[PDB]
Assembly symmetry: C2
Homo-oligomer: 222 residues x 2
Amino acid sequence: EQTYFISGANRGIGFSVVQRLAAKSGVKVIATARDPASATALNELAKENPQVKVVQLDISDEESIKKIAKNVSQYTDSIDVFVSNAAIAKSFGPLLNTPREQWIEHFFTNVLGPIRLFQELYPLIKKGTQKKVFFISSNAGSLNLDFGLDFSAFGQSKAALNYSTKELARQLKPENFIVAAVHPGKVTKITPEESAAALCKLFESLNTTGKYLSYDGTELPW
Amino acid sequence: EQTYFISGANRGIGFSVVQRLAAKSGVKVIATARDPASATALNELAKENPQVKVVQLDISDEESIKKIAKNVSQYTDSIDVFVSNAAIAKSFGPLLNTPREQWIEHFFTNVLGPIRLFQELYPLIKKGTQKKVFFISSNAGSLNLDFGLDFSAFGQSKAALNYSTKELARQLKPENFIVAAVHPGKVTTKITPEESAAALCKLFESLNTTGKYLSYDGTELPW
Ligand SMILES: NC(=O)C1=CN([C@@H]2O[C@H](COP(=O)(O)OP(=O)(O)OC[C@H]3O[C@@H](n4cnc5c(N)ncnc54)[C@H](OP(=O)(O)O)[C@@H]3O)[C@@H](O)[C@H]2O)C=CC1
Ligand SMILES: NC(=O)C1=CN([C@@H]2O[C@H](COP(=O)(O)OP(=O)(O)OC[C@H]3O[C@@H](n4cnc5c(N)ncnc54)[C@H](OP(=O)(O)O)[C@@H]3O)[C@@H](O)[C@H]2O)C=CC1
């Protein structure tokens, strides 16, 4: 049996990924929401598929991160595949029009949060078999793609997590970890369920660390 | 007549850049220190070259950044060449080993600081002739270079600011701004603060196109 950790599973790509993993046999899923009590569809999935364990996590909240290791541990001794999917996208457009608060909130939720979350959960991941570590990033975070769009604090947060993900891939190569940053697509437009089907196949198959990948398995430049 | 603005001019490259400009014919220089009152080299520099103006700036401190345009406005109608030089470099090595505060301090000092600084001085830069914007970055900030080192919060912060620098260049291109990310070199191969300064002042004056990521010598770096 394999255990997957997905942050931000209450909706979007995250929910579709949990819904996709719940169908697979022998996949325990630790699914997080800021507010489980309100996570109607996730909770109904967990009611039907007890493979699916729901836990609270606010990745902006250090006090929430300080508890995620012990709380995930109640449901599993190990994590095979870790997915940092929870993230905000609330700041686009020009630098001069981006208030301080937006830079900060993208930093805390999109950069420090995934990093702290990986720090807290690394031990559980070390004790797993797959040792796979995915940060759901964006093609917007690329330092070398031009979309002729301003991504402001959003893109800046994804470039930052990209930089530290590539560094992490190097640090955990000797421990036989697979680390990737993955663009889940434009949800050309695709549905969250399409994204999750592609993402899930990618999680399964990827067998080399340090990749910046799109959902379809092709590579993006950092 | 040109106004240069330089953050962190009390020591390091920043002092060496201000020292060189203060010898330059018809150049006014707003130089910043966290603590003007103990920036004794720079106070003597401005005493001996009063074209040099010393104002308080803590780029980690939003209250300090909220005052910079008024502080700068005391001495000048405009900024021709803006240099975000002030910055920290306190955290390297593995992710698992980088505590929360190092990631936080490098974001606030090395990313938000320069963004808020530029937001505050853009009206004065807009009013100037040269419209030249330099963020002192690092080669460690590249997403496409491998020095066989991890740079932790430091590298992340330079990469972060690098992303926004590139965006700012796109955004201000039609306002005829020249925006550049510039690696000043590894300063005391090792080079001297005065060598860095000399090469930077040369780049500051000759740089004609925007959106570039440059080393001190004027070679391009990959984003
Ligand atoms: N959709 C797209 O086109 C693209 C998306 N992405 C990436 O895809 C991932 C998910 O996107 P998508 O499903 O569309 O996003 P949604 O906005 O649909 O949902 C985001 C998820 O993140 C959770 N989340 C947000 N803030 C926090 C927080 N502080 N603590 C914990 N959980 C939080 C949300 O919970 P809550 O309901 O509580 O807000 C939700 O579960 C992200 O990593 C994003 O960066 C990037 C490229 C393109
Ligand atoms: N120099 C190098 O070899 C390399 C460094 N860089 C870049 O070059 C820049 C210049 O380096 P250098 O001047 O020698 O740096 P130093 O290491 O000597 O010190 C940092 C400088 O920034 C100031 N400073 C630090 N923190 C703050 C703050 N919170 N608010 C305001 N000012 C602050 C310091 O003033 P104070 O005395 O008060 O601390 C000092 O002038 C760096 O800041 C960095 O971005 C990048 C690549 C290589």
